[PDB]
Every structure is written in structure tokens, then in C-alpha cells.
Amino acid sequence: MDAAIRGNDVIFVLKTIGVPSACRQNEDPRFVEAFKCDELERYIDNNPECTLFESLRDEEAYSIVRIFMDVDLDACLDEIDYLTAIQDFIIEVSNCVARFAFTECGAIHENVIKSMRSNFSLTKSTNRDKTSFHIIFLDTYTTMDTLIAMKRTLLELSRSSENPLTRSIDTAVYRRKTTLRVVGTRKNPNCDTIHVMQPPHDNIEDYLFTYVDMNNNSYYFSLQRRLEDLV
Amino acid sequence: RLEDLVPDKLWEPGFISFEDAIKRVSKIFINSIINFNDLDENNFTTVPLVIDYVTPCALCKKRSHKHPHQLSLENGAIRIYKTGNPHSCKVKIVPLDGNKLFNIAQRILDTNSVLLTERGDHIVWINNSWKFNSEEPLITKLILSIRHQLPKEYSSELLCPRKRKTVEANIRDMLVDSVETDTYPDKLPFKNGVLDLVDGMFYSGDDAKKYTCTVSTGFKFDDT
Amino acid sequence: MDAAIRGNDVIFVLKTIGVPSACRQNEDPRFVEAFKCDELERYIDNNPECTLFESLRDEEAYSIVRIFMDVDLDACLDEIDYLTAIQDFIIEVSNCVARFAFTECGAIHENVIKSMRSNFSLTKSTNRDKTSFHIIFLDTYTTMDTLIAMKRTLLELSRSSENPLTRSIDTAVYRRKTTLRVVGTRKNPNCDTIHVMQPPHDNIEDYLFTYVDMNNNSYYFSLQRRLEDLVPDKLWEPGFISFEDAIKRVSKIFINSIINFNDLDENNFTTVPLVIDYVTPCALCKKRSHKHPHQLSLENGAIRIYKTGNPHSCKVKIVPLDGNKLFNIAQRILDTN
Amino acid sequence: MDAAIRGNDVIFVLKTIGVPSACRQNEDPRFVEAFKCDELERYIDNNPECTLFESLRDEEAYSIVRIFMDVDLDACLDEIDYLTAIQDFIIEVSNCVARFAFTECGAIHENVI
Ligand SMILES: Nc1ncnc2c1ncn2[C@@H]1O[C@H](COP(=O)(O)OP(=O)(O)OP(=O)(O)O)[C@@H](O)[C@H]1O
């Protein structure tokens, strides 16, 4: 546990879906770059038509990431129902993540619950037909390997509920060397739907799941066992 | 092949029979479907249902609708949405996975209110204090108490004593690992929280829960 | 009140499931047929695997039908448990529809109660995977539209009753050109599970709800208005909780006092804005005050409490108004200490 | 590649949208029927108001079918603009199918076009 383990201020983003692995390995400036929080804002402003794909730079070197999720519901939702739906969504998700963090991760169950429902970052898509967003938990740090093992129970949770927001959970994102589209950019140069920010969080630093900055209210937990004994 | 294409279908095994699934949908529409005979396991996501409106719709509470409704399948549950103007009618979801009381037992389990001790007793967490009993288990009392912290469609289902018994029986079949108790030696457990000793502050509610204190002083704390 | 409605002994049947509507009006032998009960029985014997579905010939001709219902149970139970459950279930259903008859049909309450509780027929599905059987009272007659209009009150009873049978009554069969499978026939050419007779009734005529025969010990009633005249119930529904108890529960969460507590009635609570003064921090958002008042709204069986204007500023609270009946009894026995 | 993979000239046609599953397997003549091309032409002329729907009889046995598309434009279009639109429509759909065939199917890009 050195200084670099309690901090990660380097951002690794892509610029096009389906980048070949060799082009990723050679770190060519044509496909992949490194960035800072302030610099990334300048890059987006200078390219109002760009397309970025946030991802993990190195898997085995650094695995600690923030907890993130994805939702894609193909129907408009009224505001009062939307508020009602999102209250239950946080309630059910918080319990399920904490429960696994206590039964196979050896962490304090009540500590995780307080840290997640306290401060979470919510986005909203600009499309008016469907409702989608990227909910990111801020003060809950864990390794990529834990989230991969978290996939099986999350799929069971999404399939066994009634709330439309928690039933449309995208469980396919959790894999090796994941990609999440950054806020404010398009999907393809032909797409006209982008993601915008939400109050009270305004700085861009609050929307990258690779940013590790553990403060006083942060909590950490990781799988004690490895991924090879788990047949 | 399809294995490398997608591990998805339109009707995977384990789902309920199609005729039963449609029966559930016909229950939500309190009125009667007019073109019901146009549905089978191959076109139910394309044929629009021409409902008749004698009574107000059970989904939007309007007297009648301009356009027919239409179904769609997603993530193991068929969705009901109305064509035309999407904001005119609400969204209703019909599940297909399994039963409901097992889901209730699961939800009661995630919140970490029931635990298994070495002696075999099941401690519960009610009124901000861990309680237990041998001749009469307290699981049903905890279920009825925690009824409130669940969504609406789950709360009303939790009143019939037989159904509470079923949920309790489901709960008792998930606890397999024992948990030790009373490992913190410098705390004073009260009837409505635990008073910390190292700095004098008095926690309550969620905060005063990780300290698994079984025995308690028996009276409430009065900070005044 | 002519003899045409005094006698209807023509049974109309269908052969296959999902019969196309393009052929029923043409009355093709291959899909439909007319029969007499004696002629019906021999046809069943001659074709052991035949599937038959009784249907009403023409809605505008003879709409009078017997009082029938279906119940579907998704598990198995003991035989004594059936005996005690069916008797209570018969008693409970008798009370509800009789009240509806005395309310929207202008019929004598005790006459209706006596008529059906005297005689009834019972079937049973041999499928032990899930039990489901028909019940047909013999001495109660009414038109099709009466059952259609009463579709709502049956649903309310099924939600807030006790017996497993009445908890799973199916009101979907009450529709236009409804189909009831005759007892003793398969549903599909592959499933051998059929409905079997039960003692003491054995005659086929006492198992069809289209065979109408007014004798001197039967009662008939019908709706007075037309079907396209029904007005829905008010914002409230008379089946969960009285109004004052619900309002008090709404009043208990609001720590501050409600100034306009007196103008809320059983109809205006969904529109009157709850203008409140925040002497204490708000019980929901823990804020000093707010720009706009709160509001009430009934939906699905709750009171979604929210603040209008900018709803995202204040949290949303839901009051669960329960519809159970014994739970209220338990609450009342408890609060008296 | 055999004649079963080189020949399919039997037409299996339904008689009402949404045929029940319990009868399609049994091939009830009241709901479904198999025909040849010549007998198909006679049947439609025999019945003035029939309602037919061609489908695939056995999915897992013979899965080889042609390429088909459907267009439902709820707006009147003049013939001259109709003529120019359909050609460029064939232009656009040609490139889309050809690109994927060269991408994930290995087909000859010029040949598919
Ligand atoms: N909404 C509906 N509109 C039209 N017909 C319907 C509707 N719901 C059900 N049906 C018809 O009612 C039939 C009932 O068959 P079901 O599978 O329920 O048989 P069951 O459980 O043996 O009992 P029963 O046939 O007496 O209802 C269905 O096969 C279908 O033909």
C-alpha cells in the first residue's frame, strides 16, 4: 500500500469502437491517448463531434475501480414515476451489492450501505423516446475481478424484480477490458444522442469510473479467493 | 454458430408455458381482448391488441385510447407499451421467471437482518437491537416489521399468516454459515442503540448494527 | 316475457380451439354444430378423443345464462381441505353477488341467496399438477351483460378475501362469445386430462349453462340500465380503509401541522394542494421551507405524496393503504391495549 | 451438398394469422396445408376470399431461404419520384448487405452485388 495505490490521475480513453488489440498494445496516438481531467474537457470542447470510449489502461497493473452500472429502458417514463422508480432502484441495488460484499468478500455489510446511498453520480441521456443513464457510485472501490464475479448475482437480481429501471440492467458490460462511453460524446459520428450531466455534480471528474481518489468516506473490498479455484 | 452469435432466444426453457403467460396479461387488461385469437408463440410481439373500453383502462385510468397496445419481450419479461404517443399510457411489466414469495425472502435476506449463531438460534434486528428466542422464533415478527422498507407491490402481499410462514421457511433454507457474536469488548448495548465507550458518542439505527451485541441492558437511552 | 325466453334447449358447440371468426357466421359443419343433450351424449361416446367447446349461439337471441365460474389452483391439497374450502367459498361468493344484485339489479337479497345456496353442480380436473374445476349453480339466471358489468366487483373480492379458491377466481371468461369446455373432453388432441363428473349430479343437461329451463323454484334478475351507461366509482374504492384513518396516517408523517386539514374529503384530496407551513424542518427533505405546496395522488392502491413545481427537489413518499380485512381487526384489537 | 440442400419447391402455407401451436405440429387441414406451385395457383382462384400466409415448414431441416425485404410507407409518392427512389433504394441496400458478407461471411464482395 504505497502512495500510487491511493491515487490514479491518468485517464485512458479510446476514440473508435472495435479498435484492434495490436493497435491498442502499440499505444499509437491515432487510436489511444492519455489525459487529465482538465485536458479532457479541452479536447471535447475542441471536437464537438468526437467519440471517446473510456476503458482501463492496464488490467493486471491496476484493477481498483469505482462501482458503475448501466440502464437502457425503451420507453418514456413520467417524472413522478421516474423519481419513484429510482428510489427503489438504489434501495435494491445497495442491498444486493452489500450482501455479496459480506458473504464472499469479508467486508462490513453496514459500512458499504452507508457509503453508496450517500453520494452517487447520475447522468441522463438526451433522447426523448427512451430513458438511459450511467449511475456511478463514488465512494466504493473494488477490483475488476470482484465485479466479474458480481455478474452472476446481478443478473439474478435484474431478472427477478418488477421495477422497470432495475429490470433493464445491462449485465453484459461486466467483462475483461471493459469500455464505457464518456459523458458528452457521441456513439458514432452518425448518432445524434449524447449524455449530459445532472445536478449537483458539475465537474467531469465525477463521471469516470477509472478515477481512483480515496478520501475519508471511501471504502474498499476485494475477493479473498482468486478466479481459478471458482470452477 | 448461434453460440458465438448470441446466447439469446425468444423463448428459452424454464419460462412458463406460453398459454399461461398470456393468461397473466389478460388479467392486467380488466377488459377483454377482441383479436385474442391472433396470438401464438411466433407473432405476439407484432400483432397489436385491439382492446375494447367499457371500463377505464387499468394502466392509464383514461376512459378510452386512440390506438391499440403492443407487447415486447425483454430480459425474461414481456413489456406492455402503447403505440402512437408514448406519454399517454404508463408502462407495465409482466414477469415470467418464478414465484413471488421467494423473491420476498431474498430481499429480506440481502438487508442482513437475520443471522445464524453457533448455538443455532436465529437473531433478528428489530427496534434497533438484536433479539433472539428459542421456544418461539422471531423471524415472522421481523418480516412484519420490515414490511415497510419494501416496494409497494411487495408490501400488501406480506399480511396473510400462511404467506409469512412460507417466506420464513424460505429464509431458513438460505442460512448455512454461522456468524460469531459479541467481539467488541468496549461497547454498552442499550434497547435503542449502543453507547460507544472510547469517545462517549451514542450511535443508533444503521450505525449501531455492525456491533453484533446480543444481550442488552433492557431500557432505552435518554440523552437529555 | 314469452316462451322463447322460457325455454332454450339448443346447445351450440365448437370443435377446435381458436376458431376463426370468418367461419362462425357461416356456420360450417367442420367448425360448428347444433345439438340436443341426448344427441350430444352419443356424439361424445362415438368420438373418444373429440374436443368440444360450448358457446352461445347469438348474443341478441338468448342472452340468459346460468351463473357459472372457474377457479384455478396452482398446487395440491388434502380432500377434507377441499370440502371445507369449497363450502366457505360458496358462502362468500353468494354474499357478494347477492349484494350486487340488491345494488345494481333491484332483486330480492334473501331470494337470491336462497336460490343458489340450495342447488349447485361441481366438476373437477383430474390434473393433479394444478387443480382447477368449474362450479355451476342451477337455480340462478341472468343475462350476459350483467356478468360483464359485475366483472369489477368479482376482481375486488378475489384480491381481499381469505379462501384460496376465491383468491384465484378467473373473471376473464366473462366476455363476448365466451367459450366453456364441456365436461369430459380434452382441451387439445394431445392432453388426456379431462373434467370428470362429481356426485350426485350425473345428467349432462345439469352441466351446461346454456340449457335454460325455468321451473317454479328459480330466480332471475338483470340490469336495468344499458351496458354503455356505467359510471366508474369515485376516486375512492370501498374496500381498503375508511377515509379518516388514511388521512390521519398522512397527517402523522407530516411533523408540522396541516392548516387546511378540514377541506379534504373523499373526492377533493387528489386536487387540493397541501399548503403547509414549515415551523420545523420538513419531514421529507429536512429543509427549512419550500417554494410550492405538496400534493396527493391515488395510484395502484397507495397515496404517492410529492411536491409540485420542481419535483426533483423534494423526496417522494408512498403511504401503503392496505386492503386486507383481518389485519384491520388485529390493529383495532391491539391499539386498545 | 445434397439435393435436400439443392432443392426446395414445396410451399407450406397457413390459413389464418396466429395458428395455434397444438395444431401446426399435427398439420390439421383446417388450419395449414402443403401445396405445389401449380396447385397453389388453382386454390387461390378456387376460393374468392381466402387468407393465406406462407411460412417455413421445418426450421432445423431446411433453413435456406432467399433475401426479402418489406417497406411500409404511409405517404403518397408520385411515380417519377417513385422510380428514382426505388433505384437508389436498391443502391443502398446493395452496399449494406455486401459489406457484412465481406466482413463476417467471407463472400465475394463483387459477387454478392
Ligand atoms: N382473453 C381471452 N380472450 C379470448 N379467449 C380467451 C381469453 N383467455 C382465455 N381464452 C380462451 O379460454 C380458454 C381457456 O383454456 P385454459 O387453458 O384456461 O383451460 P383450463 O384451465 O382447463 O380451463 P377452462 O378451459 O375451463 O378455462 C383458452 O384456451 C382460450 O381459448
PDB file of N, CA, C and O in Angstrom, chain A residues 115-157:
ATOM      1  N   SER A 115     -21.917   4.056   2.492  1.00  0.00           N
ATOM      2  CA  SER A 115     -21.041   4.720   1.535  1.00  0.00           C
ATOM      3  C   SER A 115     -21.667   4.871   0.154  1.00  0.00           C
ATOM      4  O   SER A 115     -21.236   5.740  -0.610  1.00  0.00           O
ATOM      5  N   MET A 116     -22.664   4.055  -0.191  1.00  0.00           N
ATOM      6  CA  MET A 116     -23.188   4.081  -1.553  1.00  0.00           C
ATOM      7  C   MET A 116     -24.411   4.985  -1.675  1.00  0.00           C
ATOM      8  O   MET A 116     -24.474   5.843  -2.562  1.00  0.00           O
ATOM      9  N   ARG A 117     -25.395   4.810  -0.792  1.00  0.00           N
ATOM     10  CA  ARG A 117     -26.584   5.653  -0.846  1.00  0.00           C
ATOM     11  C   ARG A 117     -26.286   7.100  -0.490  1.00  0.00           C
ATOM     12  O   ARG A 117     -27.136   7.967  -0.712  1.00  0.00           O
ATOM     13  N   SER A 118     -25.104   7.382   0.059  1.00  0.00           N
ATOM     14  CA  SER A 118     -24.777   8.748   0.443  1.00  0.00           C
ATOM     15  C   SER A 118     -24.530   9.620  -0.783  1.00  0.00           C
ATOM     16  O   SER A 118     -25.217  10.625  -0.994  1.00  0.00           O
ATOM     17  N   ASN A 119     -23.556   9.246  -1.612  1.00  0.00           N
ATOM     18  CA  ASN A 119     -23.130  10.090  -2.729  1.00  0.00           C
ATOM     19  C   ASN A 119     -23.021   9.182  -3.952  1.00  0.00           C
ATOM     20  O   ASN A 119     -22.177   8.283  -3.992  1.00  0.00           O
ATOM     21  N   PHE A 120     -23.876   9.424  -4.943  1.00  0.00           N
ATOM     22  CA  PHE A 120     -23.838   8.714  -6.213  1.00  0.00           C
ATOM     23  C   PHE A 120     -24.025   9.707  -7.349  1.00  0.00           C
ATOM     24  O   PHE A 120     -24.739  10.703  -7.200  1.00  0.00           O
ATOM     25  N   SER A 121     -23.393   9.429  -8.485  1.00  0.00           N
ATOM     26  CA  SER A 121     -23.425  10.309  -9.644  1.00  0.00           C
ATOM     27  C   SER A 121     -24.368   9.742 -10.695  1.00  0.00           C
ATOM     28  O   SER A 121     -24.224   8.586 -11.105  1.00  0.00           O
ATOM     29  N   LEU A 122     -25.315  10.563 -11.139  1.00  0.00           N
ATOM     30  CA  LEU A 122     -26.326  10.162 -12.105  1.00  0.00           C
ATOM     31  C   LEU A 122     -26.235  11.039 -13.344  1.00  0.00           C
ATOM     32  O   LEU A 122     -26.063  12.256 -13.241  1.00  0.00           O
ATOM     33  N   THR A 123     -26.338  10.416 -14.513  1.00  0.00           N
ATOM     34  CA  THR A 123     -26.404  11.125 -15.780  1.00  0.00           C
ATOM     35  C   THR A 123     -27.826  11.041 -16.333  1.00  0.00           C
ATOM     36  O   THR A 123     -28.743  10.541 -15.676  1.00  0.00           O
ATOM     37  N   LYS A 124     -28.025  11.549 -17.549  1.00  0.00           N
ATOM     38  CA  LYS A 124     -29.285  11.345 -18.254  1.00  0.00           C
ATOM     39  C   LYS A 124     -29.045  11.533 -19.745  1.00  0.00           C
ATOM     40  O   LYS A 124     -28.325  12.451 -20.150  1.00  0.00           O
ATOM     41  N   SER A 125     -29.610  10.637 -20.549  1.00  0.00           N
ATOM     42  CA  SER A 125     -29.496  10.743 -21.993  1.00  0.00           C
ATOM     43  C   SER A 125     -30.367  11.885 -22.513  1.00  0.00           C
ATOM     44  O   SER A 125     -31.347  12.296 -21.886  1.00  0.00           O
ATOM     45  N   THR A 126     -29.996  12.399 -23.684  1.00  0.00           N
ATOM     46  CA  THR A 126     -30.738  13.470 -24.329  1.00  0.00           C
ATOM     47  C   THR A 126     -31.881  12.969 -25.199  1.00  0.00           C
ATOM     48  O   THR A 126     -32.676  13.786 -25.677  1.00  0.00           O
ATOM     49  N   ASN A 127     -31.983  11.661 -25.419  1.00  0.00           N
ATOM     50  CA  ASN A 127     -33.084  11.118 -26.199  1.00  0.00           C
ATOM     51  C   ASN A 127     -34.393  11.269 -25.435  1.00  0.00           C
ATOM     52  O   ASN A 127     -34.432  11.196 -24.203  1.00  0.00           O
ATOM     53  N   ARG A 128     -35.474  11.486 -26.178  1.00  0.00           N
ATOM     54  CA  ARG A 128     -36.791  11.689 -25.590  1.00  0.00           C
ATOM     55  C   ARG A 128     -37.701  10.478 -25.728  1.00  0.00           C
ATOM     56  O   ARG A 128     -38.800  10.480 -25.164  1.00  0.00           O
ATOM     57  N   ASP A 129     -37.280   9.445 -26.459  1.00  0.00           N
ATOM     58  CA  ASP A 129     -38.103   8.250 -26.593  1.00  0.00           C
ATOM     59  C   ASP A 129     -37.780   7.232 -25.506  1.00  0.00           C
ATOM     60  O   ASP A 129     -38.687   6.674 -24.878  1.00  0.00           O
ATOM     61  N   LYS A 130     -36.499   6.979 -25.272  1.00  0.00           N
ATOM     62  CA  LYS A 130     -36.051   6.028 -24.267  1.00  0.00           C
ATOM     63  C   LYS A 130     -35.363   6.759 -23.122  1.00  0.00           C
ATOM     64  O   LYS A 130     -34.963   7.920 -23.240  1.00  0.00           O
ATOM     65  N   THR A 131     -35.231   6.058 -22.000  1.00  0.00           N
ATOM     66  CA  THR A 131     -34.598   6.594 -20.799  1.00  0.00           C
ATOM     67  C   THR A 131     -33.396   5.722 -20.465  1.00  0.00           C
ATOM     68  O   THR A 131     -33.549   4.534 -20.163  1.00  0.00           O
ATOM     69  N   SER A 132     -32.205   6.310 -20.519  1.00  0.00           N
ATOM     70  CA  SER A 132     -30.968   5.611 -20.209  1.00  0.00           C
ATOM     71  C   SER A 132     -30.033   6.548 -19.462  1.00  0.00           C
ATOM     72  O   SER A 132     -30.107   7.770 -19.611  1.00  0.00           O
ATOM     73  N   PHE A 133     -29.148   5.966 -18.658  1.00  0.00           N
ATOM     74  CA  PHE A 133     -28.189   6.749 -17.890  1.00  0.00           C
ATOM     75  C   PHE A 133     -27.052   5.837 -17.451  1.00  0.00           C
ATOM     76  O   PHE A 133     -27.048   4.635 -17.726  1.00  0.00           O
ATOM     77  N   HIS A 134     -26.079   6.429 -16.762  1.00  0.00           N
ATOM     78  CA  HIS A 134     -24.939   5.705 -16.206  1.00  0.00           C
ATOM     79  C   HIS A 134     -24.783   6.122 -14.751  1.00  0.00           C
ATOM     80  O   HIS A 134     -24.221   7.184 -14.465  1.00  0.00           O
ATOM     81  N   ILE A 135     -25.272   5.294 -13.838  1.00  0.00           N
ATOM     82  CA  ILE A 135     -25.183   5.557 -12.407  1.00  0.00           C
ATOM     83  C   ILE A 135     -23.837   5.035 -11.925  1.00  0.00           C
ATOM     84  O   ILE A 135     -23.508   3.860 -12.119  1.00  0.00           O
ATOM     85  N   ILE A 136     -23.048   5.908 -11.308  1.00  0.00           N
ATOM     86  CA  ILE A 136     -21.713   5.569 -10.829  1.00  0.00           C
ATOM     87  C   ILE A 136     -21.670   5.842  -9.333  1.00  0.00           C
ATOM     88  O   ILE A 136     -21.992   6.949  -8.884  1.00  0.00           O
ATOM     89  N   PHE A 137     -21.271   4.837  -8.559  1.00  0.00           N
ATOM     90  CA  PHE A 137     -21.088   5.022  -7.127  1.00  0.00           C
ATOM     91  C   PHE A 137     -19.685   5.548  -6.852  1.00  0.00           C
ATOM     92  O   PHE A 137     -18.702   5.048  -7.405  1.00  0.00           O
ATOM     93  N   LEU A 138     -19.595   6.567  -5.997  1.00  0.00           N
ATOM     94  CA  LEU A 138     -18.365   7.343  -5.891  1.00  0.00           C
ATOM     95  C   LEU A 138     -17.397   6.802  -4.849  1.00  0.00           C
ATOM     96  O   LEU A 138     -16.187   6.775  -5.094  1.00  0.00           O
ATOM     97  N   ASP A 139     -17.893   6.368  -3.697  1.00  0.00           N
ATOM     98  CA  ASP A 139     -17.044   6.065  -2.551  1.00  0.00           C
ATOM     99  C   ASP A 139     -17.063   4.574  -2.260  1.00  0.00           C
ATOM    100  O   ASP A 139     -17.168   4.133  -1.113  1.00  0.00           O
ATOM    101  N   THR A 140     -16.959   3.771  -3.316  1.00  0.00           N
ATOM    102  CA  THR A 140     -16.968   2.317  -3.180  1.00  0.00           C
ATOM    103  C   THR A 140     -15.975   1.760  -4.196  1.00  0.00           C
ATOM    104  O   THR A 140     -16.280   1.689  -5.390  1.00  0.00           O
ATOM    105  N   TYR A 141     -14.799   1.371  -3.716  1.00  0.00           N
ATOM    106  CA  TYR A 141     -13.700   0.959  -4.573  1.00  0.00           C
ATOM    107  C   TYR A 141     -13.481  -0.546  -4.474  1.00  0.00           C
ATOM    108  O   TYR A 141     -13.500  -1.124  -3.386  1.00  0.00           O
ATOM    109  N   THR A 142     -13.271  -1.176  -5.628  1.00  0.00           N
ATOM    110  CA  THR A 142     -13.044  -2.613  -5.695  1.00  0.00           C
ATOM    111  C   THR A 142     -12.305  -2.928  -6.989  1.00  0.00           C
ATOM    112  O   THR A 142     -12.206  -2.091  -7.890  1.00  0.00           O
ATOM    113  N   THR A 143     -11.789  -4.150  -7.075  1.00  0.00           N
ATOM    114  CA  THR A 143     -11.030  -4.609  -8.229  1.00  0.00           C
ATOM    115  C   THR A 143     -11.963  -5.095  -9.333  1.00  0.00           C
ATOM    116  O   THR A 143     -13.111  -5.468  -9.080  1.00  0.00           O
ATOM    117  N   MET A 144     -11.451  -5.084 -10.568  1.00  0.00           N
ATOM    118  CA  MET A 144     -12.225  -5.583 -11.703  1.00  0.00           C
ATOM    119  C   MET A 144     -12.629  -7.037 -11.521  1.00  0.00           C
ATOM    120  O   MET A 144     -13.701  -7.444 -11.981  1.00  0.00           O
ATOM    121  N   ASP A 145     -11.786  -7.836 -10.863  1.00  0.00           N
ATOM    122  CA  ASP A 145     -12.096  -9.252 -10.697  1.00  0.00           C
ATOM    123  C   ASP A 145     -13.348  -9.448  -9.853  1.00  0.00           C
ATOM    124  O   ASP A 145     -14.145 -10.356 -10.116  1.00  0.00           O
ATOM    125  N   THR A 146     -13.536  -8.612  -8.831  1.00  0.00           N
ATOM    126  CA  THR A 146     -14.726  -8.730  -7.997  1.00  0.00           C
ATOM    127  C   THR A 146     -15.992  -8.473  -8.802  1.00  0.00           C
ATOM    128  O   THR A 146     -16.984  -9.197  -8.659  1.00  0.00           O
ATOM    129  N   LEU A 147     -15.978  -7.448  -9.657  1.00  0.00           N
ATOM    130  CA  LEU A 147     -17.161  -7.138 -10.453  1.00  0.00           C
ATOM    131  C   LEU A 147     -17.491  -8.269 -11.418  1.00  0.00           C
ATOM    132  O   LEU A 147     -18.666  -8.536 -11.693  1.00  0.00           O
ATOM    133  N   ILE A 148     -16.469  -8.938 -11.950  1.00  0.00           N
ATOM    134  CA  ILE A 148     -16.711 -10.067 -12.844  1.00  0.00           C
ATOM    135  C   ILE A 148     -17.435 -11.183 -12.102  1.00  0.00           C
ATOM    136  O   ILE A 148     -18.376 -11.789 -12.626  1.00  0.00           O
ATOM    137  N   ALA A 149     -17.010 -11.470 -10.870  1.00  0.00           N
ATOM    138  CA  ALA A 149     -17.727 -12.448 -10.058  1.00  0.00           C
ATOM    139  C   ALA A 149     -19.087 -11.913  -9.627  1.00  0.00           C
ATOM    140  O   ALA A 149     -20.007 -12.690  -9.353  1.00  0.00           O
ATOM    141  N   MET A 150     -19.233 -10.588  -9.557  1.00  0.00           N
ATOM    142  CA  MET A 150     -20.509  -9.977  -9.205  1.00  0.00           C
ATOM    143  C   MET A 150     -21.559 -10.146 -10.291  1.00  0.00           C
ATOM    144  O   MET A 150     -22.735  -9.862 -10.041  1.00  0.00           O
ATOM    145  N   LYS A 151     -21.162 -10.583 -11.487  1.00  0.00           N
ATOM    146  CA  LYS A 151     -22.081 -10.618 -12.619  1.00  0.00           C
ATOM    147  C   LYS A 151     -23.240 -11.573 -12.379  1.00  0.00           C
ATOM    148  O   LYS A 151     -24.390 -11.264 -12.711  1.00  0.00           O
ATOM    149  N   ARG A 152     -22.958 -12.744 -11.809  1.00  0.00           N
ATOM    150  CA  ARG A 152     -23.974 -13.786 -11.719  1.00  0.00           C
ATOM    151  C   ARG A 152     -25.130 -13.362 -10.819  1.00  0.00           C
ATOM    152  O   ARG A 152     -26.300 -13.586 -11.150  1.00  0.00           O
ATOM    153  N   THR A 153     -24.826 -12.740  -9.678  1.00  0.00           N
ATOM    154  CA  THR A 153     -25.895 -12.329  -8.774  1.00  0.00           C
ATOM    155  C   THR A 153     -26.636 -11.103  -9.294  1.00  0.00           C
ATOM    156  O   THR A 153     -27.844 -10.971  -9.064  1.00  0.00           O
ATOM    157  N   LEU A 154     -25.942 -10.200  -9.989  1.00  0.00           N
ATOM    158  CA  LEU A 154     -26.613  -9.039 -10.565  1.00  0.00           C
ATOM    159  C   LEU A 154     -27.622  -9.456 -11.624  1.00  0.00           C
ATOM    160  O   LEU A 154     -28.723  -8.898 -11.697  1.00  0.00           O
ATOM    161  N   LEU A 155     -27.263 -10.433 -12.457  1.00  0.00           N
ATOM    162  CA  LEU A 155     -28.198 -10.934 -13.458  1.00  0.00           C
ATOM    163  C   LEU A 155     -29.430 -11.533 -12.793  1.00  0.00           C
ATOM    164  O   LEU A 155     -30.558 -11.346 -13.263  1.00  0.00           O
ATOM    165  N   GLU A 156     -29.228 -12.259 -11.692  1.00  0.00           N
ATOM    166  CA  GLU A 156     -30.361 -12.808 -10.956  1.00  0.00           C
ATOM    167  C   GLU A 156     -31.230 -11.707 -10.371  1.00  0.00           C
ATOM    168  O   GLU A 156     -32.458 -11.836 -10.343  1.00  0.00           O
ATOM    169  N   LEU A 157     -30.617 -10.619  -9.899  1.00  0.00           N
ATOM    170  CA  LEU A 157     -31.390  -9.515  -9.339  1.00  0.00           C
ATOM    171  C   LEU A 157     -32.221  -8.825 -10.412  1.00  0.00           C
ATOM    172  O   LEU A 157     -33.402  -8.529 -10.203  1.00  0.00           O
TER     173      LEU A 157
END
